[PDB]
Enzyme design. Sequence first.
Site, PDB file in Angstrom:
ATOM      1  N   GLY A  40      46.672  32.081  52.773  1.00  0.00           N
ATOM      2  CA  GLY A  40      45.924  32.313  51.698  1.00  0.00           C
ATOM      3  C   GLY A  40      46.110  33.429  50.983  1.00  0.00           C
ATOM      4  NE  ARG A  41      48.200  33.040  45.666  1.00  0.00           N
ATOM      5  CZ  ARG A  41      47.596  31.713  45.153  1.00  0.00           C
ATOM      6  NH1 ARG A  41      46.224  31.385  45.809  1.00  0.00           N
ATOM      7  NH2 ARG A  41      48.313  30.750  44.620  1.00  0.00           N
ATOM      8  CE1 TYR A  44      38.582  41.191  42.718  1.00  0.00           C
ATOM      9  CE2 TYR A  44      37.837  39.173  42.848  1.00  0.00           C
ATOM     10  CZ  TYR A  44      37.716  40.119  42.278  1.00  0.00           C
ATOM     11  OH  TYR A  44      37.356  40.325  40.812  1.00  0.00           O
ATOM     12  CE  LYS A  62      38.185  38.245  52.165  1.00  0.00           C
ATOM     13  NZ  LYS A  62      36.851  37.464  51.679  1.00  0.00           N
ATOM     14  CG  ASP A 150      34.047  32.132  44.372  1.00  0.00           C
ATOM     15  OD1 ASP A 150      34.105  31.256  43.295  1.00  0.00           O
ATOM     16  OD2 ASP A 150      34.922  33.033  44.616  1.00  0.00           O
TER      17      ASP A 150
END
Length: 327
Positions: A40-41, A44, A62, A150
């Site tokens: 994932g990306r 941030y 991460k 979020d």
Amino acid sequence: SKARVYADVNVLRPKEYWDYEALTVQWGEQDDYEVVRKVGRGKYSEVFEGINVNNNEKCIIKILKPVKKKKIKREIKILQNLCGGPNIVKLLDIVRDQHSKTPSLIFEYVNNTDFKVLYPTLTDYDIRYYIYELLKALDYCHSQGIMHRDVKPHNVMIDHELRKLRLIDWGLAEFYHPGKEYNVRVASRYFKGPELLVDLQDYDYSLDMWSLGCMFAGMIFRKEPFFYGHDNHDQLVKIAKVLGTDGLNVYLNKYRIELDPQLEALVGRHSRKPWLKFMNADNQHLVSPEAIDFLDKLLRYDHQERLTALEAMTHPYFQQVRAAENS
Ligand SMILES: O=C(O)Cn1cnc2c(Br)c(Br)c(Br)c(Br)c21
């Protein structure tokens, strides 16, 4: 405005619980964790499946992009405070590269399925089940004085084979303090509540319940995302065309907010559309009066009127999920 539940959690707790700037990070050993593949990306971070070389167990690594000290401490402290709660991702270690000082957060591994391919296959029961499991995570974090800020499908990891869910990416989350004015530049546009869109800064946990309601609407109506605005102004317009402008004016008057004249001009005048205007052939098996009732009680302009996550868990839409859990 004040939260109607859990308003005093940080008032009662030791100052160290919520004073995340006072945190002294205890760095692990970077060589304990090796990257296996990128998964994932975002703006941030980049995210990788990894291995712990000591015990050969999977993890998630991460790697954070350049960020202020304050912001990294906030995410670490909130993860530490929440670790162990139902369906909350588990922060296991925190490491950094000696030369560049790039930090990595190390999590328990979760074996997720791309929501864009999973959600079309979920049955009506599966929607009720995963939304219940997500509400366990939201009521837990709110009970611990934290807003996620979020909530969206991208931050809800689901392993559908194992029926396991984790709420991830606590990088935008904050501690709730009564009367505090927060930055409204949080959440993903399609999941921003009206409070963010009209610059009501003294919001609370109920923001997460609007984002939840946008996710749920998307699932039961098979319309991803449900409110499809192209910028923040257009986002309020897309909401006002469904909820109607009468409700909006009532809200704005109650909190003594005036819209920027340009925003006022764009929003115009709209009647309230009924939720059944959205049902069609592809989604029909998922849409029921209990689903609409539950949805209507989440998607309210006035953040004070939305269900709390603990109230949402008790709604009869979830009766079968509760009954199943009881045994
Ligand atoms: O953004 C984050 O916090 C981390 N993040 C981004 N993509 C992530 C994925 Br895919 C998984 Br699975 C996990 Br567990 C985390 Br944690 C992820």
